[PDB]
Amino acid sequence: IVGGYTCGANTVPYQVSLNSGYHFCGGSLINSQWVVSAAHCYKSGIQVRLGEDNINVVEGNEQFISASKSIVHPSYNSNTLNNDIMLIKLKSAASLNSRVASISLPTSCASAGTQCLISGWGNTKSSGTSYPDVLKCLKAPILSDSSCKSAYPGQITSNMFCAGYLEGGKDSCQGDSGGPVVCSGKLQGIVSWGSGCAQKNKPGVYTKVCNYVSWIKQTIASN
Ligand SMILES: [Ca+2]
Numbered sequence: 001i002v003g004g005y006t007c008g009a010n011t012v013p014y015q016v017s018l019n020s021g022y023h024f025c026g027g028s029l030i031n032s033q034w035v036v037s038a039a040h041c042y043k044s045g046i047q048v049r050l051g052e053d054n055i056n057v058v059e060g061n062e063q064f065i066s067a068s069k070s071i072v073h074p075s076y077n078s079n080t081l082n083n084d085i086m087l088i089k090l091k092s093a094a095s096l097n098s099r100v101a102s103i104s105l106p107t108s109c110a111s112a113g114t115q116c117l118i119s120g121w122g123n124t125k126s127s128g129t130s131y132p133d134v135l136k137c138l139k140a141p142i143l144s145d146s147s148c149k150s151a152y153p154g155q156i157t158s159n160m161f162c163a164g165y166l167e168g169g170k171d172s173c174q175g176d177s178g179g180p181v182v183c184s185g186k187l188q189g190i191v192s193w194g195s196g197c198a199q200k201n202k203p204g205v206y207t208k209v210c211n212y213v214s215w216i217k218q219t220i221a222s223n
Contacts, residue, residue, distance in 0.1 A: 001118065002126050002198035003170035004138035009053035010061055010099035012119045012135060014187075015180060017049040018088075019064075026120045026179020028187050031102050032093040034220055037178035038190050038207065039076040039086040046070065048090055051100045054133045055121055061099045065090045071219060073212070082157045084192040084207045087219055105217075106186040109210035112144040116163060116183035118204070120176030120191060126168075126198035131175060138172065140164045142183070143203055151201055159211050161189065164203035172204045173197035181206050 016027040016035055025041035027048065035048055051061040068091040073083040094100055110116070118138045124130050140163045143151075148162035156162070163181060164171050172179070172191045181189030189206030196202060 001120055001122055001136035001138045001176055002124055002173050004124070004136045007119055007135045007137040009059070009134070010051065012117070012137065013099050013101040014103035015052070015119050015135060017052050017055055017121060018178060019047045019049050020045050023055050023121050023175065025175070025177050026191060027088065028180040029094065029100070029102050030105060030187065030216070031220070032096055033090050035088040035090065036187065036190065036209070036216065037086050037088060038084045038192055039072040040078065040081060040084055040192070041178040042070060042072050042086055046088060048088060050094050053135055056133045063094050063100060065092055065094060067091070069223060071223070073215070080155070080157070081193050083159055085190055085209070085212055087216065089223060103180065103182060103187045104185060105213050106188055106210045109208065110142050110183045110188040112142050114142050114183045115139050116142065116181050116188065118163070118172050118176070118179070118181050118191065120172060120179040122176030123173040123197060126171070126196065138170055140170065148203070148205070151203060152205065156205070159208050160192065160205050161208050162203045162205055163189065166201055166203060168200035169198050171198035
């Protein structure tokens with residue numbers, strides 16, 4: 001996250017870190033056994049780390065649980081990042097508490113103008129590289145479809161929305177991918193892509209979760 005703030009330990013209790021020897025992607029806990037992330041985050045050997053603040057120090061609220069199954073969306077296209085969403089089932093159920101908690105799925109889509117909370121352990125510089133150990137947060141509005149399409153001609157599908165600031169300086173970044181965009185207590189986006197980070201006229205592009213709730217629910221009901 002560029003231009004954000006230190007969330008505070010365990011204040012984003014649905015935030016997960018995906019670990020394959022090192023943090024490489026965010027996710028969101030959506031019930032005791034399932035994590036939503038970005039399909040472009042797919043790899044084998046995933047350990048899900050819940051209850052994290054400092055990803056480099058064992059602080060006492062962590063739960064580390066191996067992935068038993070990953071399911072990338074049936075229609076994911078890695079070239080266009082259309083349908084940039086995947087589900088991860090945990091080998092055992094997380095113990096849900098005040099610091100490890102699921103995030104509600106939306107019943108309706110967010111609209112342009114709604115402020116949202118975006119979080120992750122991604123890069124904090126737009127012209128440089130510095131990775132935080134503790135979780136970083138950013139409050140950002142959804143942008144209109146037209147201004148999203150105008151920022152990225154020929155690239156925005158109906159499964160994508162933009163959020164952030166056209167003026168630059170505040171965005172998600174590399175290593176935030178897969179993580180949450182939460183608006184009024186509902187998971188409305190997944191950190192997906194963008195041209196650099198926090199660049200003028202190049203806001204963050206997010207997977208539009210409301211389009212996938214049917215798929216998420218049916219997948220969870222059969223796996
Ligand atoms: Ca830790």
